[PDB]
Short mmCIF file of C-alpha atoms and ligand atoms in Angstrom, two decimals:
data_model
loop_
_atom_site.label_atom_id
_atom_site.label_comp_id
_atom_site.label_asym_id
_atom_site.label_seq_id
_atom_site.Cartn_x
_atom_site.Cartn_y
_atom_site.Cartn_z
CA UNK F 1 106.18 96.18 116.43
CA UNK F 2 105.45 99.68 117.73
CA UNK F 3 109.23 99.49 119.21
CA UNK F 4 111.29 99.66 116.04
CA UNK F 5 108.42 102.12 114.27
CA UNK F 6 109.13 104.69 116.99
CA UNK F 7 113.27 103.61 116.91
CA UNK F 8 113.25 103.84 113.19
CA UNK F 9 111.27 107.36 113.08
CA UNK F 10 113.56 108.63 116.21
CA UNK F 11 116.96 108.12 114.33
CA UNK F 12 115.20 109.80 111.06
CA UNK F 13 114.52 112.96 113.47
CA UNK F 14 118.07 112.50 114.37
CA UNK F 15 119.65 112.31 110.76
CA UNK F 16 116.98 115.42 109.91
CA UNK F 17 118.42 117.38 112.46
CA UNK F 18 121.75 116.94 111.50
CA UNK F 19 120.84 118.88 108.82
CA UNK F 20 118.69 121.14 110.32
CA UNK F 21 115.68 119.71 108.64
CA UNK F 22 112.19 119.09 110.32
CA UNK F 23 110.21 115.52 110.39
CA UNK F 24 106.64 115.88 109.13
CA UNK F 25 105.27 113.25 111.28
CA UNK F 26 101.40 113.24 110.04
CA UNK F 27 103.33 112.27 106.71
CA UNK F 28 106.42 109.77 107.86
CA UNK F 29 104.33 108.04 110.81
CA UNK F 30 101.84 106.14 108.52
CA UNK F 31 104.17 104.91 106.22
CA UNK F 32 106.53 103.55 108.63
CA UNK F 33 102.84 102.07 110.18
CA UNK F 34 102.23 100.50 107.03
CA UNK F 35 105.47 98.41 106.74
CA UNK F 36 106.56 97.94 110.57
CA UNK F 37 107.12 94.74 110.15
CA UNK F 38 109.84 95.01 108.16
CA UNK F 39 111.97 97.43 110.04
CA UNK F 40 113.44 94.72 111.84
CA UNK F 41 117.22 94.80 112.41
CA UNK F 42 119.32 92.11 110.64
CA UNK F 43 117.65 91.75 107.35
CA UNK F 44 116.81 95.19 106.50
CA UNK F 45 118.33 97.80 105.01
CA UNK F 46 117.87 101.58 106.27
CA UNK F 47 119.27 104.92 104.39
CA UNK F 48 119.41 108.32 105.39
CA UNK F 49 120.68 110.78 102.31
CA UNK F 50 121.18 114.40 102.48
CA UNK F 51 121.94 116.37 99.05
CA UNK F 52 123.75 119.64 98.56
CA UNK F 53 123.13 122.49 96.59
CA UNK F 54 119.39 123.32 96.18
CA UNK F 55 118.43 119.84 98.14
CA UNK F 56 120.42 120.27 101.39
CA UNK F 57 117.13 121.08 103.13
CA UNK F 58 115.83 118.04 102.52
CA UNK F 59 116.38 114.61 103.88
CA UNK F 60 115.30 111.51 101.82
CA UNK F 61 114.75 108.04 103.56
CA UNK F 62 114.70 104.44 101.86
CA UNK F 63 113.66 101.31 103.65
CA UNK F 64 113.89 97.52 102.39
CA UNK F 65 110.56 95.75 101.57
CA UNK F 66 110.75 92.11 101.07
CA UNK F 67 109.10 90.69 98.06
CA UNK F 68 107.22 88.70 99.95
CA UNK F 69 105.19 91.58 101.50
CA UNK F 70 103.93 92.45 97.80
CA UNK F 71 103.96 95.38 95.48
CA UNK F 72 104.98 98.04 97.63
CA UNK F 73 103.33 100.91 95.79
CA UNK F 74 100.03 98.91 95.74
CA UNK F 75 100.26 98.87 99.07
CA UNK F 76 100.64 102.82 99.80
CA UNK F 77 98.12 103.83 97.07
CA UNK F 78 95.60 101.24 98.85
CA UNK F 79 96.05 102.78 102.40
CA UNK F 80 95.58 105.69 100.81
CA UNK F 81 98.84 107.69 101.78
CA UNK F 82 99.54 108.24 98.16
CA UNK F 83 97.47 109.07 95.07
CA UNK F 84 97.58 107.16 91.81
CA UNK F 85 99.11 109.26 89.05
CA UNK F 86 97.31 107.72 86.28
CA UNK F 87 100.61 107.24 83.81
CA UNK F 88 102.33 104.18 83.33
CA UNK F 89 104.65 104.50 86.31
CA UNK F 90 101.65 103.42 88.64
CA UNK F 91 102.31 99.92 86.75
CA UNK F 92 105.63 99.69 86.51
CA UNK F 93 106.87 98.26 89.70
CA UNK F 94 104.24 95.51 89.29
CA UNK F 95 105.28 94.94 85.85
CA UNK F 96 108.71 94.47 86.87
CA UNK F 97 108.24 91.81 89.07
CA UNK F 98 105.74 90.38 86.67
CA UNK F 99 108.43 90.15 84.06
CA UNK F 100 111.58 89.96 86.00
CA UNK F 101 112.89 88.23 88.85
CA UNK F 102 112.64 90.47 92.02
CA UNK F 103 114.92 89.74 95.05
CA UNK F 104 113.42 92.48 97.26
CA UNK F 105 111.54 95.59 97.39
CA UNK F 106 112.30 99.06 98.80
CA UNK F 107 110.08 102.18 99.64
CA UNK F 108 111.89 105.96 99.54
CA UNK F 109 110.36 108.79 100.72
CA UNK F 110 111.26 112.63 101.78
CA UNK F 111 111.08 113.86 105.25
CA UNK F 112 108.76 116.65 104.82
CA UNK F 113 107.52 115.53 101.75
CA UNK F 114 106.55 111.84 102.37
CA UNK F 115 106.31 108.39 100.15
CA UNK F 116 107.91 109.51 96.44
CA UNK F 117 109.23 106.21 95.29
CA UNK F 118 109.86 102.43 94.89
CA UNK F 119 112.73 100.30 94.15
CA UNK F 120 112.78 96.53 92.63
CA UNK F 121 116.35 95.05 93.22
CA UNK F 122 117.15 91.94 90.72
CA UNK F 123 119.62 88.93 91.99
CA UNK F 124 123.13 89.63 91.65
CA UNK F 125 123.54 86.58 90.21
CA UNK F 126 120.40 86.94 87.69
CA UNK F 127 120.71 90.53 86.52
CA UNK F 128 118.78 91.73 83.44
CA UNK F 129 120.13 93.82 80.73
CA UNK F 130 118.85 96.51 78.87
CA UNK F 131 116.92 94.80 76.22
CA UNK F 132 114.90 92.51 78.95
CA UNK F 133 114.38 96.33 80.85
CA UNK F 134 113.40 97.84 77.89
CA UNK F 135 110.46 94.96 77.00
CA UNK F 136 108.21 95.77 80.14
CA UNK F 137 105.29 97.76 79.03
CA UNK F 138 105.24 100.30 81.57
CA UNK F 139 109.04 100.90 81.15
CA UNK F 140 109.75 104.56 79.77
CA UNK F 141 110.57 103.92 75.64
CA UNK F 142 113.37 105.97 76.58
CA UNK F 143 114.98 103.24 77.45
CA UNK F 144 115.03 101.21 74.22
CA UNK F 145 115.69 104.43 72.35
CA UNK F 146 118.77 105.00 74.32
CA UNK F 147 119.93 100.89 74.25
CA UNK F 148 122.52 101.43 71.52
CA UNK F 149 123.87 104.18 73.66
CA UNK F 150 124.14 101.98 76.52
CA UNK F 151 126.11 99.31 74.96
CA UNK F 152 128.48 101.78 73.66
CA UNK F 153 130.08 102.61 77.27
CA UNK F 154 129.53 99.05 78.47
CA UNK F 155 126.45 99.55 80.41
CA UNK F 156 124.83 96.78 80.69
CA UNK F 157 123.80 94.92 83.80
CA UNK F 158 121.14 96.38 86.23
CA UNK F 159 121.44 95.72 89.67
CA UNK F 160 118.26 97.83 90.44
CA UNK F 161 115.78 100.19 89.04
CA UNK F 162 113.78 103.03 90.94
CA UNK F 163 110.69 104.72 90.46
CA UNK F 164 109.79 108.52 90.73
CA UNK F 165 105.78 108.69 91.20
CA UNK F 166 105.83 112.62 91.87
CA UNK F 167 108.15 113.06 89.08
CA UNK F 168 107.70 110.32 87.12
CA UNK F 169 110.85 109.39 86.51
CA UNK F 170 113.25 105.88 86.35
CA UNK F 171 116.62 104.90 87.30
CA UNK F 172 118.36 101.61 86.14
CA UNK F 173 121.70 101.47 88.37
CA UNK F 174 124.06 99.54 86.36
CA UNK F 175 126.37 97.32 87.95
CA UNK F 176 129.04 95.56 86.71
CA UNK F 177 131.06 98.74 85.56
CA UNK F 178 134.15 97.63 83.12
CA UNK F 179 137.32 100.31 84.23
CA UNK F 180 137.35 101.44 80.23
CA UNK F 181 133.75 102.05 80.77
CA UNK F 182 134.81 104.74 84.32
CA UNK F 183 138.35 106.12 82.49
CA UNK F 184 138.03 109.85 81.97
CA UNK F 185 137.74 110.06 78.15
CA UNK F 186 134.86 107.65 78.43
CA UNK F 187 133.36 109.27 81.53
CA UNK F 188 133.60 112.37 79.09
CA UNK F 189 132.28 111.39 75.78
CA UNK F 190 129.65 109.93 77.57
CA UNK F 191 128.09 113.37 79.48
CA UNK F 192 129.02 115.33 75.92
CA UNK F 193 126.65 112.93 74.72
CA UNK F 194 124.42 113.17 76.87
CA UNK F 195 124.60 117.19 77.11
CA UNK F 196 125.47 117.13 81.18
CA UNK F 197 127.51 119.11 83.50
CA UNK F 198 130.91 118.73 82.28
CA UNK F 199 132.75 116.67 85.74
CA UNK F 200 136.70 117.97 86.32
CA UNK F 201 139.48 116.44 87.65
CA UNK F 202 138.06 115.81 91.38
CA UNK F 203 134.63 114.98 89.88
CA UNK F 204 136.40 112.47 87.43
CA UNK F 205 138.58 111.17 89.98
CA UNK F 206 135.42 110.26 91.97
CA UNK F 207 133.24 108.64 88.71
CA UNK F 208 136.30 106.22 88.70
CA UNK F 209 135.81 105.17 91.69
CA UNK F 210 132.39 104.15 91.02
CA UNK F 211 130.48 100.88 91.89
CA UNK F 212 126.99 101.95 90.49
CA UNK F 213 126.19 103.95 87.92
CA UNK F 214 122.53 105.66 86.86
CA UNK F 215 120.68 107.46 84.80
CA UNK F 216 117.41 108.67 85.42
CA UNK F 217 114.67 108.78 81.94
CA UNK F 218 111.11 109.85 81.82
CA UNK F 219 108.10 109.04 80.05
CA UNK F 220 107.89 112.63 77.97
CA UNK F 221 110.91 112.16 75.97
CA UNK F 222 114.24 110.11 74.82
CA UNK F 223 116.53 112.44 76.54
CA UNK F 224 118.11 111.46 80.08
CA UNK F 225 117.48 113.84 82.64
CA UNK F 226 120.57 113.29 84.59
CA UNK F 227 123.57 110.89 85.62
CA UNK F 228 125.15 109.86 89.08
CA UNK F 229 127.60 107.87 89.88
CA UNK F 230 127.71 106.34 93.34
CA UNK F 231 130.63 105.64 95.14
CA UNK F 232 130.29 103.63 98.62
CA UNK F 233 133.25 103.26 101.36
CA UNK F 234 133.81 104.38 105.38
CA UNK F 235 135.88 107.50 104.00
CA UNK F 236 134.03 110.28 105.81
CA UNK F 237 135.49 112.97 103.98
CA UNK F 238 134.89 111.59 99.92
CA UNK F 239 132.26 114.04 98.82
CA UNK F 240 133.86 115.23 95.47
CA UNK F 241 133.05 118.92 95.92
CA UNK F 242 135.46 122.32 96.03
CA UNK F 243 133.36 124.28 98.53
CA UNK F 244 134.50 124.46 102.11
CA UNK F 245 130.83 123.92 103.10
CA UNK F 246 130.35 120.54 101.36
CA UNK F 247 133.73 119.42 103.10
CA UNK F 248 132.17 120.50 106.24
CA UNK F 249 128.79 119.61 106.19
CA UNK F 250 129.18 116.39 104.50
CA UNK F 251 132.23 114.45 106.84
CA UNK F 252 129.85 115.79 109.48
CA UNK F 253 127.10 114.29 108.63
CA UNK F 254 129.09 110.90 107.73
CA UNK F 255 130.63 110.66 110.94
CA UNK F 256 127.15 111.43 113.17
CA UNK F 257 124.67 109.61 111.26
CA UNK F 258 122.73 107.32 113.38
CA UNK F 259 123.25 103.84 112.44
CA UNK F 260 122.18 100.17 114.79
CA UNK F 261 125.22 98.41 113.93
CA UNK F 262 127.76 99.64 116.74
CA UNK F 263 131.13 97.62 116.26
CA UNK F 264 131.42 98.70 112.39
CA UNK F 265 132.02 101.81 110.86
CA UNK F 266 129.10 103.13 109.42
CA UNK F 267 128.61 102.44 105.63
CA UNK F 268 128.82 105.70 103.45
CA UNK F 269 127.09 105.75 99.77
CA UNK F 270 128.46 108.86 98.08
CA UNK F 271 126.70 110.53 94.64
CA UNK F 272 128.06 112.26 91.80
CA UNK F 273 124.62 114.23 90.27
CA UNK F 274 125.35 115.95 86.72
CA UNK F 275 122.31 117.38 85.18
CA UNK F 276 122.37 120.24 82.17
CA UNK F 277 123.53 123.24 83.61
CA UNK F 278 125.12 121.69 87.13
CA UNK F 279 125.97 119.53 89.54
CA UNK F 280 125.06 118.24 93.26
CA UNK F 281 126.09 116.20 95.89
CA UNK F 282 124.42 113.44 98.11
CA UNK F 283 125.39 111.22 100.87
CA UNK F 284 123.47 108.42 102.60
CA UNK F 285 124.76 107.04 105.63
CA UNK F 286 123.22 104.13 106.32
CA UNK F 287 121.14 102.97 109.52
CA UNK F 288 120.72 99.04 108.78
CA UNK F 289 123.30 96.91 106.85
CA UNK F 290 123.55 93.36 105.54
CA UNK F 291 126.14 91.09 104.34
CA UNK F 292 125.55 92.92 100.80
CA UNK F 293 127.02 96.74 101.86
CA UNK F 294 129.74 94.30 103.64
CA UNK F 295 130.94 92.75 100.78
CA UNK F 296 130.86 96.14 98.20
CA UNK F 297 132.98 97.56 100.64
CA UNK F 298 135.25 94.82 100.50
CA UNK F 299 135.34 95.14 96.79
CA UNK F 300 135.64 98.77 96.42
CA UNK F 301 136.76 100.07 99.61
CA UNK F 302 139.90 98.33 99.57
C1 LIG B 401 117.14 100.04 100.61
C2 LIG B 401 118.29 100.45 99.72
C3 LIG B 401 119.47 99.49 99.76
C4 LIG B 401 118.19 101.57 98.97
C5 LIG B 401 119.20 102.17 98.02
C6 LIG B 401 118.66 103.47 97.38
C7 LIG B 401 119.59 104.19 96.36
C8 LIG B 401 120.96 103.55 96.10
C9 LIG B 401 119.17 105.34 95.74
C10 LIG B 401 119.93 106.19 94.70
O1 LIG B 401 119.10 107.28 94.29
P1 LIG B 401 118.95 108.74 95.01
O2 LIG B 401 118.57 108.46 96.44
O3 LIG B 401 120.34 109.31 94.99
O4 LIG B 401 117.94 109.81 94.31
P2 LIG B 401 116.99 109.82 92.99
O5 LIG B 401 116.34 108.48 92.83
O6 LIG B 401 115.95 110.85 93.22
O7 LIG B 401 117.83 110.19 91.84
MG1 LIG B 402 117.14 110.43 97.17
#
C-alpha cells in the first residue's frame, strides 16, 4: 500500500527532525518500497532511535519483517539497494533461520545512510543458548571463544541477534537476566573483563534496571567491541547521562516522537553503550507496538 509507505516515511522525517537530522529519500524510499506490505499497523513493530555523543546526528530506523516474507537481506541485496560484502555475515541471517527457529524478521537502517542491518528474533518460549548460537557456520568464532565467559555472569538465553553488514558486526541480546547477573559488582567485573568504559553510580543504577542485555563481536577477533544494556519503560526522562543536554534533548525527544497508537503512552527503549575509552546514549521511541512491548513494560516498568 502506497498509504502506509508514505505514512511510515512521513513520521521518520518527523522523528529526523526532531533531531535536526535530514531524510535521504533516494536511499529510505526504496527500502520502505521493498517491504510495504509489512508496514501495516497492528502486527508490526516500528523504531525510531537517536544516539548521543558522536551519533546524535544520526537517526536509525528498524522495521518488523515477518518470516514469512523470507530472508530479509536476500531480499535487499537482490533489488539491488545493498551490495554483498563477501564475508560470512552475508550468510548469517540465512543460516540462522536454517539452524534455528525464527519467529520474525526485522530490517534497520540509518536515515542518511540507508539499509545497515538485519535482525532474527527466536520464540520466547524456544530461546537458544550460546552453544546452539555458537554452532552456525557463519556465526563470528567469537562467540564460542567467549561461551565460558558468558556462563560466568549468567548470560545465557538469546532473545534476538542482529547483524551489522557495513560493519560487520553481531549482537546476541540476552534475555532472561538473573538480578546477581545486573548487581553492581557483577555489572563491574564483567566490563573489567571485558576492558570497557567503567559505568558509575547513575550508569549502574540504570544496567540494573535492565531487561536486555548485548554485546556486539566481529569476525576479526575474540574481543567484544562493546556492551549495552537496554532498559524499556514510559519514563521520559531515564537516559542515564550527567550532561544537561542529554536531559534535554533526550525527554524531548521521548515525549514528541511520533507513534500510531494514540490512547497509550508511547513505549521508550533506553541504551546504556560502553565501549573502550567511553560511553553513549540511545533512545528509540517507538512508532508501532504489539502485545510484546505491552507485556515488558508490565514486567519491568512496574
Ligand atoms: C523491530 C524491533 C522490535 C527492533 C528492535 C531493535 C533493537 C532492540 C536494537 C538494539 O540495537 P541498536 O539499535 O541500539 O544499535 P547497534 O545494533 O548498532 O548496536
Ligand atoms: Mg541503532
Amino acid at each position: 500500500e502506497a498509504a502506509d509507505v508514505e505514512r511510515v516515511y512521513a513520521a521518520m522525517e518527523e522523528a529526523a527532525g526532531l533531531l535536526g537530522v535530514a531524510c535521504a529519500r533516494d536511499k529510505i524510499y526504496p527500502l520502505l518500497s521493498t517491504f510495504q506490505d509489512t508496514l501495516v499497523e497492528g502486527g508490526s513493530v516500528v523504531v525510531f532511535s537517536m544516539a548521543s555523543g558522536r551519533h546524535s546526528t544520526e537517526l536509525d530506523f528498524s522495521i518488523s519483517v515477518p518470516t514469512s516474507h523470507g530472508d530479509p537481506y536476500a531480499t535487499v541485496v537482490e533489488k539491488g539497494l545493498f551490495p554483498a560484502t563477501g564475508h560470512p555475515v552475508d550468510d548469517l541471517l540465512a543460516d540462522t533461520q536454517k539452524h534455528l527457529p525464527v519467529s520474525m524478521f526485522a530490517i534497520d537502517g540509518e536515515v542518511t545512510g540507508g539499509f545497515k542491518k538485519t535482525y532474527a528474533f527466536f520464540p520466547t518460549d524456544n530461546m537458544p543458548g550460546v552453544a546452539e548460537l555458537s554452532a552456525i557456520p557463519s556465526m563470528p568464532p567469537a562467540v564460542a571463544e567467549n561461551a565460558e565467559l558468558f556462563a560466568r555472569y549468567g548470560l545465557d538465553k538469546v532473545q534476538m541477534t542482529s547483524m551489522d553488514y557495513k560493519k560487520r558486526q553481531v549482537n546476541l541480546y540476552f534475555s532472561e537476566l538473573s538480578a546477581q547477573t545486573l548487581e553492581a559488582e557483577s555489572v563491574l567485573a564483567l566490563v573489567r573483563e571485558l576492558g570497557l568504559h567503567v559505568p558509575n553510580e547513575l550508569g549502574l543504577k540504570f544496567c540494573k534496571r535492565s531487561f536486555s542485555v548485548y554485546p556486539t563481536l566481529n569476525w576479526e577477533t575474540g574481543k567484544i567491541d562493546r556492551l549495552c544494556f537496554a532498559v524499556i519503560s514510559n519514563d521520559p526522562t531515564l537516559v542515564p547521562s550527567s550532561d544537561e543536554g542529554d536531559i534535554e534533548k533526550f525527554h524531548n525527544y521521548a515525549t514528541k516522537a511520533p507513534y500510531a497508537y494514540v490512547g497509550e503512552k508511547r513505549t521508550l527503549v533506553y541504551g546504556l553503550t560502553l565501549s573502550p575509552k567511553e560511553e553513549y546514549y540511545k533512545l528509540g521511541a517507538y512508532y508501532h507496538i504489539t502485545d510484546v512491548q505491552r507485556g515488558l513494560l508490565k514486567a519491568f516498568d512496574s
